[PDB]
Each structure stands twice: as C-alpha cells, then as structure tokens.
Design an enzyme around this catalytic site. Structure first.
Site, short mmCIF file in Angstrom:
data_model
loop_
_atom_site.label_atom_id
_atom_site.label_comp_id
_atom_site.label_asym_id
_atom_site.label_seq_id
_atom_site.Cartn_x
_atom_site.Cartn_y
_atom_site.Cartn_z
N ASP A 117 0.85 -1.19 0.00
CA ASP A 117 0.00 0.00 0.00
C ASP A 117 0.89 1.25 0.00
OD1 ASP A 117 -2.36 1.75 0.37
OD2 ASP A 117 -1.93 1.71 2.54
N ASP B 217 -4.21 3.26 3.09
CA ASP B 217 -5.61 2.91 3.26
C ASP B 217 -5.73 1.41 3.50
OD1 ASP B 217 -4.89 2.12 0.70
OD2 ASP B 217 -6.53 3.18 -0.34
N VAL C 137 -5.10 -0.78 1.41
CA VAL C 137 -5.43 -1.37 0.12
C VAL C 137 -4.24 -1.23 -0.85
CG1 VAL C 137 -7.08 -1.38 -1.77
CG2 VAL C 137 -7.80 -0.72 0.48
N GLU D 12 -1.47 -19.11 -21.91
CA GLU D 12 -1.91 -20.40 -21.41
C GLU D 12 -2.62 -21.01 -22.62
OE1 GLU D 12 -5.92 -18.23 -19.50
OE2 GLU D 12 -4.65 -19.53 -18.26
N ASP E 288 -4.88 -13.81 -21.09
CA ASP E 288 -5.79 -14.74 -20.43
C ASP E 288 -6.78 -15.39 -21.42
OD1 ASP E 288 -8.86 -14.38 -19.29
OD2 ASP E 288 -7.65 -15.55 -17.86
CA LIG Z 1 -3.88 2.11 -1.16
#
Ligand SMILES: [Ca+2]
Ligand SMILES: [Ca+2]
Lengths: 441, 441
Positions: free
Chosen positions: A13, A17, A19, A216, A186
């Site tokens: 982070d 936060d 996050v 893949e 992907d």
């Molecule tokens: Ca953050």
C-alpha cells in the site's frame, strides 16, 4: 530472467488505506530487486467491479482503488529505473457485463451487436465448457442468446470480426506506448472457434510487436509449439504441476516424463511457476506440505531450463487452499512484519490462512537462515548469476526412483544438478546427495 | 428524523472499481431520499490501514479508496441539496499504532510522549476492560507499557493534556468547516479516567459548537442523562436490544420495562437502531428470525419516541452473524440487484452471508409489496409525515404478555399503537391484531 506474479491489492500500500496500489508497488522495488526479480506479472489493473478484475468494464481506465493513470505511469517509470519490467494481465478474450460495448449491444446498437457472439438458428444451445462442463450459451429475456465461456457475466468477444481485432490491437499499442513491457493473455486458446484459426489470429495480432508475451494454451503439444513460436513464452502447467507431485510422491517418474515432454528442445521459452491464482498455493499442495518439501520444490524450479516464476507469497511459504466461489482465499495480504502493521502493509480483509504472528512475515524470515525466504534468496541469486540456464540443454545422468541427476549446458557452460526426493544420502560421481536437497557442481 | 449508518466500502461504487467511495455515495442520494433518510452516519473515512478504519493514522486525510477531498466535498454538497445531513464517525478517543504522534512518542519525543497514556509504578498492569474483560495495558520491548482500551494497536490519547484537547478541538472545527453536520464519538465514556471528569470534558469540548453529536455512554441510564443534556442525542443500546429480545420471546415484559427505563421522560433524543457494526444483523439475531419478526422489530422501531436508525441493508433482511477477528462478516456488500451486477454495485470480496440471487436486492424487493423493504418504506413514509413523534409522550393503554398497546401524543397530536408479538391473533377492545402484526389509529 526471473518472474514474479502480483495481486496488486494484497502486495504493498502506498497511500495508507490498507489497500494495495500503484504507489506501494513503486516502493517494493528494493524488495523485488533483492529477490532478484526481472519482471512482474500484474493481475488485472483495469476498471472491473470484482476484486480480481478478470471482467473488464473499460480497458482505457485503471482500477481507482489502485490509483490514477498518472500514478500508474509514474510506477512504470520507477521500475524501469531499477531494471525491472512490467507485464500486465490482459483479459481481452471477453469483457464484463457492464462494459459500455455490451450494454449498447443489449439495447440493439448494430455497431456493437457484432462485437459479441450471438446464437444462430443452427447453434447448439447446450454446448458446454471443457473443465466446468457448465454451459456457454446464455439467455436474455427478449429471446436472445449470447455466448460466454467464463459465465453469463463475462460475454465472449467476436474475433471473427475485423472491427474487434482492430479495437484491441489499438489498445495493446497504447499500453506498449505507455511503457508496458508485455502482456499475459488470459484464455489465449479460445480466441477463435477452431485451433487453426486461433494460431493465425495470434500470428496477425502480435505480428508487428515486440515484448514479453505470455500465454496459457492447453493443446498439450504440437499446437502449444505452433502458438509458442508466436508468443515466445508459454505458461508451463505441465512441469509446474509435476515438480510438486514428484516431491510429494517422492518419485522422479512424473518429473522426468514432464521434462522430456514439456521442457526439452522448444522453439520458445517455457515458463515454470510455484503456483498461481487459479489453484492452491505451493505450501498447500495436496493437503499442504513441509518446509523442507516446499524448499525442494523451489530448488528444482530454479535448476530447470525455461523461466522460473514465483506467485507472491510463495517465497515465504504462504498458505492457501483454493476454493470457489470465494477464490480470494489464495489472495491473502502479503505480510511485511509479524504484527502486520507497518507503513505499506495491506489489510483489506482478515486473512484466510496467513494471519499475524505466524512467523511468516518478510521481516521475520529475513532473520532465520533456515527460512523459506532465506532459501529462496539463495537459489534466486544463483539463477540471477546464470542466465544461460534459461535456454540450456538438459542431459540425464541418473534417473532413479528416489533421486535424479542431470547436466545443463550450452556452448560455454555446463552444470551438474542433483535432486534427492527422499530421506537419506546417496553418492553420485563422488557427490553426497543429502535428503530432500539439491546440489549443483 | 430518520438515520442511516453506512459502511462506505460496501454501499455504493461511483468509479467503476467495485469499491464503495464518496462518489457512489453521492449517487445513492435518490434511494436515501426515497427511503426517507434525514442524516447518514458514515463509518470512519480517514486514513487507516484497516478495512474498518477505527484505528486512524491521519485525521487530516481521507481513505484513498473512498476518494479525494475534492470528491468528499462534492458529496457533502449533493446530500445537502437534497436536505440530507452528514454525520461522521469520529474515533478521536485514540489513534492507530502507525499515527505520526505515536511513532514520535515511541521515540521518547518530549512533546508527543504526553499525547498518550504511559503505565506507572502505581498502575495496575493487569487491569482489564469491562465488556470482554481484557488488558488495557500493553508492553514494549524496553519495559514501557502504554494504555490501549481497544488493544496494543489502538493507543489511548491523553485528554488530561490540554494540547491533545486543542489538537482535536481544531480537527472538529476543520470538519465542521467542510459542511459536516455532526459526529459520532465512540468510547465516549472513557475520555477521562473518572466519570465526573469525562462529563466535564465533553461539556467544554462541545460547549461552543453546534451539530448532531451521537455517543454511547453505558452508565446504564444513571449518569447517562447527564451526558445526554450535552450531546443532545444518545445511542439507546438498551431499548434497541430489548425490541429484538422481546420479538424473539413474544413476551412484552422486557420491552415495557425497557421503554419505561430509556425512552420515557428524557431531556434529549434517544436514538433507537436496528443494529451496528459491532453485533449480529437484525435478521441474524439469536439464531436469527423470520420475515414476520424482522417486520415487527421495524414496526416497533418506527413507533417509539426518539430517533429511528437503520444500519445499511437492514431494510432488506441482510444476514450477518457477528464474530471476531474477521468482523467484516457483518459488512457484506449492499445488493442493488439479484445478480449484483449493475453500475454502482460493490463487490470487493465474496459475500459472507448474502451471496447473489438470494432475493434480497433492492431491485427485487422493490416490486413486491410483501418485502421487508416495502414494509420499511411504509414506516419511513409514516414517520416522515409525523415529525411530532420524536418528542412525543407515550402512555400505556394495555399490557399483556403477548401484545401491547400505547398512545403517542403531544398538545395537538394523538395516535394509538397496537403491537402483537405472538403467533396467534389477539384482541383488545373489539379489535384483533393478527399474529406479528401492528396497527396504528
Ligand atoms: Ca492504497
Ligand atoms: Ca471505488
């Protein structure tokens, strides 16, 4: 080349936060550089309403929780400054249900209608995926059916249409133009309806481009090779799985077959990994397994040709038993200290398997020379100092049930590797092969 | 006056990343106005690394995942344009471990050491907290111990220090300057060591300010009214529990004694709520209960003097069994539609107790006059048309073990309310209330 896959929300982070985000990533360079990382595979960083983000609603904007486009471009710049490449996970096989393109198709916009795949009078409304075996055609109330392999919320993009191809190649040049070093495509296998059409799609698509392209593609062989020439790097689920099974079954058989099958004489670099986001973690393999077995898995991974890749946390032996639909059990917060409380630490949810004071924080393992981190740092420094192994040739010298020995070499080198999957020494060419250890000479 | 408590991250996403933010919140004004809300109480919007944010690292900066100050202000203005007030959860009782003031204290910084509470030669190191009954004193490698009511990581600020008072008095002004309409102070009872001092504090702190100040002061209806004259609002944890307890036993004893104890004859407004981030959801109360009982609790909540407050999602019957340390289990994403796939929808983790297609989304319940939402909407419409009730007087007209009848009134308004808590029809004066039903007159 050494790779490292990151789930951005759980790594570092940078704005306090709890996050994970683009600024934090920027600050983990010292750590990545110390772990010997050449490139990073970043899971979906675009606008998506899922925590994982494989259903993009707009490829032209990034996940707000991770930061702005300006913050994103500053991070690319900082990584390049320290000699690391950035490879983005690019889910362009389909879009999210909420992408503006699909919404206009639903409301009848003819332009966008052809951006997707709709059911024809002669369509097998009961067709199912390989794996899941769950259906791939989905109904709308007005009587229509649109195709969506990964679900009714991840509608398939129509590559038979030149418009879509154009729309997406424009996006790749844009991100490339931005500094991105490559992509993880992907679902690369289902771009077209038949495999022959698929190989040509990728030929034209990636034709004029330069960069790290990962894919893949499960056709097990000859197609994987057809595709591999075009991509240059192919995710190795074969050997990646086999290294772990052998160590677990303490029997070289599978690992030997797999090497001769998926690693030798390829016209492309195969990419071997500790694990990834679609399965259980290396440390939780088959009901999870011991510190010495995790370690051995890494020893083998780093003494094989191709490119070695570590899923964030695996270098610490983080735990995680894959599960649906709450697949975030394998995406636990990366622990920098024991208390899981330090600038840069992420805590967006309570951890599923790796909670605080568990003796697995980076801070903690850096100190015990007996730790998985201390061990991984050993093999990664070794590998860093021997780039030639990536494309080196393999020569078997000993294929015994309990142990294996082979030789890596090219025009100006040769190294002998010794793997003992059992518990009790055994001598080969005068070398003592300890229990559950790797030796190079 | 109706209140609504929101866990921002789980309510509404306004930047297409699946994370609740200040922008989404602004876009939910239509719903809140339509649901009859007057003021919203927002759980912690300041920097902190926890998913809940009660341990703040900086009160002068907002949680990045929620948005910028640019966007916070845009939200304040929008809510006000629709006559809705904004009340912010303000944990100024303590700071997080990572807050700048504490780091300096940890270093023995003269000035900042006295911002916190350090153990003594005359302090009881084994002292414990009422509730859970745990240590309030936490150790340090170097023999020191600081006080932390909510743990080793939520250090207590020292309000004996005039500087801490000033420091926070300014934050308050700072926030009120932005258009913030009030605060919710947690652990408001533990601001000063002796309850005679606490009262003194709050009198002075709040003395010259104007706004909505919510607090929890467990002096069990004793000192409780002394603090009530000062804040003007009191979180009535008492009756809020007794409503649910009563409905659960179908026995009006606890509710009548509770009503007589907390709601009747108070010189401030008691705030009666469905639940909060610290306990199981209404719908998951004691093994939880049926649609019928959920509806009754609400009916009883909206027909008592004081201020009714709904914890986000309670107007739908959202499930949630509280437990630690993963307290996020009762903070499930608010379901806007059944598929939980609509712009505005949050999906930052897989729901713990409310996965998609469970028939509780706003969209689904809206077209069903039998839903909990339709029921709640009916009571908010009623309460909206009867302001006088908040400050009304209620006198009992009938008390039976199975039902209850009372009258709400003031100099110019009178309303009779009949509640039936039993599973069988009951009668009072030529009027029978069917099981679990409510009727006013
Ligand atoms: Ca953050
Ligand atoms: Ca957001």
């Amino acid at each position: 080349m050494i790779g490292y896959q990151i789930y951005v929300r759980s790594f570092r982070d940078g704005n306090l936060d709890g996050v994970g985000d683009f600024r934090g990533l920027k600050n983990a360079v010292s750590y990545l550089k110390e772990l010997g990382i050449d490139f990073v595979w970043l899971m979906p960083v675009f606008s998506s309403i899922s925590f994982h983000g494989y259903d993009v609603v707009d490829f032209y904007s990034f996940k707000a929780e991770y930061g702005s486009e300006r913050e994103f471009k500053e991070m690319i710049e900082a990584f390049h400054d320290s000699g690391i490449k950035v490879v983005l996970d690019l889910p362009i096989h389909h879009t999210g249900f909420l992408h503006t393109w699909f919404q206009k198709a639903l409301k009848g916009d003819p332009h966008y209608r052809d951006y997707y795949v709709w059911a024809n009078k002669e369509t097998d409304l009961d067709e199912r995926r390989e794996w899941d075996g769950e259906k791939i055609w989905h109904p709308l109330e007005d009587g229509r059916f649109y195709r969506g392999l990964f679900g009714p919320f991840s509608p398939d993009l129509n590559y038979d249409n030149p418009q879509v191809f154009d729309e997406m190649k424009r996006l790749v040049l844009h991100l490339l133009d931005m500094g991105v070093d490559g992509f993880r495509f992907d679902a690369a296998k289902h771009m077209r309806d038949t495999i022959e059409q698929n190989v040509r799609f990728w030929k034209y698509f990636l034709s004029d481009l330069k960069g790290i392209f990962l894919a893949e593609i499960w056709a097990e062989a000859r197609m994987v090779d057809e595709h591999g020439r075009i991509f240059g790097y192919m995710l190795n689920f074969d050997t990646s799985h086999c290294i772990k099974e052998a160590v677990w079954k303490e029997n070289t058989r599978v690992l030997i077959e797999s090497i001769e099958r998926a690693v030798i004489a390829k016209d492309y670099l195969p990419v071997n990994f500790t694990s990834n986001h679609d399965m259980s973690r290396l440390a939780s393999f088959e009901g999870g397994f011991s510190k010495e077995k995790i370690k051995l898995s890494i020893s083998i991974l780093f003494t094989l040709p191709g490119v070695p890749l570590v899923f964030y946390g695996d270098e610490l032996g983080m735990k995680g038993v894959y599960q649906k639909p709450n697949t975030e059990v394998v995406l636990d917060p990366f622990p920098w200290n024991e208390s899981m409380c330090v600038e840069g630490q992420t805590f967006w949810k309570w951890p599923a398997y790796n909670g605080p004071f568990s003796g697995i924080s980076v801070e903690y393992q850096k100190r015990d020379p007996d730790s998985i981190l201390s061990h991984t740092l050993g093999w990664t420094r070794f590998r860093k100092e021997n780039q030639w192994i990536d494309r080196a040739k393999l020569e078997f010298l000993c294929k015994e049930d309990k142990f294996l020995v082979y030789r890596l070499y090219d025009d100006q080198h040769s190294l002998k590797v010794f793997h003992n999957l059992s518990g009790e020494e055994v001598v080969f060419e005068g070398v003592k092969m300890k229990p559950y250890k790797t030796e190079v000479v």
